[PDB]
Ligand binder design. Structure first.
Ligand SMILES: CC(C)(COP(=O)(O)OP(=O)(O)OC[C@H]1O[C@@H](n2cnc3c(N)ncnc32)[C@H](O)[C@@H]1OP(=O)(O)O)[C@@H](O)C(=O)NCCC(=O)NCCSCC(=O)c1ccc(O)cc1
Ligand SMILES: CC(C)(COP(=O)(O)OP(=O)(O)OC[C@H]1O[C@@H](n2cnc3c(N)ncnc32)[C@H](O)[C@@H]1OP(=O)(O)O)[C@@H](O)C(=O)NCCC(=O)NCCSCC(=O)c1ccc(O)cc1
Ligand SMILES: CC(C)(COP(=O)(O)OP(=O)(O)OC[C@H]1O[C@@H](n2cnc3c(N)ncnc32)[C@H](O)[C@@H]1OP(=O)(O)O)[C@@H](O)C(=O)NCCC(=O)NCCSCC(=O)c1ccc(O)cc1
Ligand SMILES: CC(C)(COP(=O)(O)OP(=O)(O)OC[C@H]1O[C@@H](n2cnc3c(N)ncnc32)[C@H](O)[C@@H]1OP(=O)(O)O)[C@@H](O)C(=O)NCCC(=O)NCCSCC(=O)c1ccc(O)cc1
Lengths: 140, 140, 140, 140
């Protein structure tokens, strides 16, 4: 789809209609400890001053960290939802791509924590996100 | 378009083409110490599991806090960009609207800080965002 | 003690020997939704440049938010521990007192969230802390 | 005293009288991109439930990241103070040492950002702190 982990036969919202598909997020790699994703910059990713929207970096980090957790825990009967997202912005991006790498740093019974680095086409660190993902028994 | 502050005669990217116009953010009240905005929930705002995307709350807080700062500082020769966005998620929203209220709590010379509450249609506090906005002289 | 909630007959560490008692934190008010505490500035609260240590504000917020949660949940068989502490620093404090007010904004089954405001003797907002407190069944 | 960088001929407050000297923080390595420090756990570091206080991890990260910045910028006429400290807690520490490693990830002209890991004696990641340090010209 955007290559999200295939863990269920039906999803409530089709990729192309979600925020993820609308702005164009695509997952490249995914393992239990490390996942990567990326997006082309288009105006849909921008704010009116022409820079990538701060919310775009937050949303990229959120889907990558959450879905990399879903990829492990869904078959174990658990759901995984974002609980906290702290993104800090170091350098703006005006065009090209934004590439995210999520590295898992803690995997607890109720919380997984991911460090996400957001880089521009020159490899420069433009933002980071500390993602905290709540993991709970799936409700009937 | 989304009732963002009119502080310039032209902008790099038109409202309807930005992330904010694409998902449908609209500013209601705007003062130097407080601002509100809301968005109707549609699939464009959701992730594939059918909930409002964590990134959408981050983005709504981000735009509102930044533009509320812009409204004040632009005519003083400053720009205002997000430097830190920490959003915590308390309850999911499945449909209706998300309504954001931003309250200014510190206005320094280099950093303004806003507390943003994001509520659902029943008035419940579903997410909060602590927004730090860097204020710097405009380069042109 | 520092007037911490009296919820158990024995505690592993006496007040006066903990970090709290060593720097002098004292709780003034406590209810399920709102708690206050304060400390005299002494060198023990300072760093070597003579300002209150950033860690002092974090530690004040942490004990106040956590113990205001303990005050409700301990008798229900639960423990409460800090899970995240985000403190932002707006104005330094060189002497006098630091006064903290914690307002509960969410009380979930597994997480309570407290906004803490840290004010100087003139009432000025010097720092804030967003405290996330994990609440778990007490282990035998 | 705690092996903090020697960048001035005198300081307002002596090491042994500061928070850092009182709880016993000691800097081991210090470079412009990386620094380490450690502390022996004693009751002075703990809270009443017998665990290292959340505030102590915050303070150790705070001092290390700030002073690591100080080591570089002081001789350039700048001061460096904590602007934001976000510490997340993964595992409690009851005794032994806490060992902090600070890695610089962004060095802007107004803000330096450090990732701090806090590990226990077995090497386990017990807490992390994202430290944003404001760099500003010294007023004298
Ligand atoms: C926050 C949380 C409970 C969340 O759990 P998680 O992310 O699902 O991690 P998980 O549940 O897999 O457990 C990790 C470790 O946490 C501990 N833990 C987790 N749940 C429990 C529990 N129900 N009972 C006892 N220990 C637990 C235990 O050490 C566990 O390891 P293990 O024995 O299971 O191998 C766990 O990450 C944690 O315990 N983190 C540390 C909390 C901490 O140390 N905070 C700072 C101290 S408490 C706050 C404070 O400063 C304070 C100061 C003054 C004052 O008067 C009161 C409070
Ligand atoms: C971070 C910042 C500098 C950013 O400024 P801002 O948000 O734009 O606010 P603004 O610049 O308008 O100034 C607000 C107040 O900050 C102070 N300030 C700002 N710039 C300066 C400066 N260049 N020189 C001295 N003070 C300044 C000043 O008190 C100012 O009030 P005023 O005298 O200008 O009315 C300001 O918010 C601030 O100073 N916050 C407090 C920082 C703080 O106290 N952090 C904790 C202590 S430092 C870190 C630490 O714990 C540590 C521990 C051990 C150790 O060995 C080393 C460090
Ligand atoms: C995070 C947490 C589960 C923690 O729970 P808590 O602080 O203990 O709160 P509590 O458990 O009392 O429940 C509050 C509400 O959360 C929901 N909830 C809590 N636990 C569960 C559960 N096990 N199953 C279903 N719903 C639950 C439920 O709505 C609950 O209300 P109620 O039905 O019990 O009245 C709860 O606060 C929460 O659900 N918060 C919202 C999480 C959220 O909406 N995050 C953003 C969306 S998920 C992340 C994301 O953006 C994403 C994007 C793309 C993608 O592909 C994947 C993910
Ligand atoms: C926040 C800050 C200005 C602080 O500076 P710093 O950490 O000291 O780094 P420094 O000042 O060294 O500059 C780093 C880069 O930032 C940019 N920058 C810094 N100061 C300026 C300035 N005065 N004017 C223009 N660009 C600047 C510049 O690109 C710089 O690289 P260089 O050209 O100087 O090599 C810089 O880190 C930065 O720009 N970060 C990125 C900010 C960002 O992109 N936030 C997200 C977008 S803005 C918020 C938003 O989403 C929004 C959405 C809707 C809406 O309607 C309004 C806003």
């Amino acid at each position: 789809g955007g290559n999200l982990p295939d863990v269920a036969s039906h999803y409530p919202v089709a990729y192309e209609q979600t925020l993820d598909g609308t702005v164009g997020f695509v997952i490249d790699e995914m393992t239990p400890e490390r996942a990567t994703a990326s997006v082309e910059v288009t105006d849909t990713l921008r704010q009116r001053w022409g820079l990538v929207h701060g919310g775009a970096y937050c949303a990229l980090a959120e889907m990558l960290a959450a879905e990399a957790t879903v990829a492990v825990v869904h078959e174990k009967g658990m759901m995984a939802v974002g609980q906290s997202n702290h993104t800090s912005f170091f350098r703006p991006v005006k065009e090209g791509h934004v590439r995210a790498e999520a590295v898992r740093i803690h995997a607890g019974s109720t919380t997984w924590f991911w460090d996400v680095s957001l880089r521009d086409d020159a490899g420069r660190l433009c933002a980071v996100s500390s993602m905290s993902i709540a993991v709970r028994p799936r409700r009937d």
